Enzyme design. Structure first.
Site, mmCIF file in Angstrom:
data_model
loop_
_atom_site.group_PDB
_atom_site.id
_atom_site.type_symbol
_atom_site.label_atom_id
_atom_site.label_comp_id
_atom_site.label_asym_id
_atom_site.label_seq_id
_atom_site.Cartn_x
_atom_site.Cartn_y
_atom_site.Cartn_z
ATOM 1 N N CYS A 95 39.612 117.894 -52.091
ATOM 2 C CA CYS A 95 40.232 119.155 -52.484
ATOM 3 C C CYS A 95 41.663 118.924 -52.912
ATOM 4 O O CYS A 95 42.115 119.453 -53.932
ATOM 5 C CB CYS A 95 40.209 120.157 -51.328
ATOM 6 S SG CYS A 95 38.590 120.663 -50.778
ATOM 7 N N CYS B 223 40.235 118.574 -46.342
ATOM 8 C CA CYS B 223 39.345 117.945 -47.306
ATOM 9 C C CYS B 223 40.200 117.190 -48.313
ATOM 10 O O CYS B 223 40.963 117.793 -49.076
ATOM 11 C CB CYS B 223 38.454 118.974 -47.990
ATOM 12 S SG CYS B 223 37.450 118.256 -49.320
#
Lengths: 105, 105
Positions: free
Chosen positions: B35, B32
């Site tokens: 993230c 991700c």
């Protein structure tokens, strides 16, 4: 049957083999409860829609593919046809998945 | 500091060592992008908030913790205090995260 993609080479091969068919790609993870609950429903759907190609991508094992597709939520279903992204569904909502296979195939 | 939870007992120990403090748990994945973008901001923030315990859980390495907490979207920030789930934020919106920290700490 829903075909488990091993890696990018396998993914590319499956996408080419689909020809002009709708491809539904289930991006999932084994830590995702709803992914494991919708999986048997997808297996059955793949048996009844022979004109649609169903793939699944374990994002924990295919991180490059996940990030190339900017996946965020588990599961995410991508709807592809003729190399174009047509739609995306976040969440394990089978009825919406069925609606999108009709909207797009 | 943002402490890397290693397994479920490590998690429990951190939650117990927090006493009455707000605990912010960043459930993230290395596939991700957002993230990884928000991670340094969270680290920098943690160094000015000794009244808050910042933890991070790599869902790919703590799959049972992820499943037990019914995580779906990356990242998800879980706000816990005195054993109660106060709130949950999905997405890498740093300003919203900070607003939620201020409201609950």
């Amino acid at each position: 049957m829903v075909y488990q993609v091993k890696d990018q080479e396998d993914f590319t091969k499956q996408l080419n083999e689909a020809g002009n068919k709708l491809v539904v790609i289930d991006f999932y993870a084994t830590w995702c409860g709803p992914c494991k609950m919708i999986a048997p429903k997808l297996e059955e759907l793949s048996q009844s829609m022979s004109d649609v190609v169903f793939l699944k991508v374990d994002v924990s094992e295919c991180e490059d593919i996940a990030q190339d597709n900017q996946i965020a939520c588990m599961p995410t279903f991508l709807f592809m046809k003729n190399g174009q992204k047509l739609d995306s569904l976040s969440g394990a909502n089978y009825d919406k998945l069925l609606e999108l296979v009709e909207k797009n195939k």
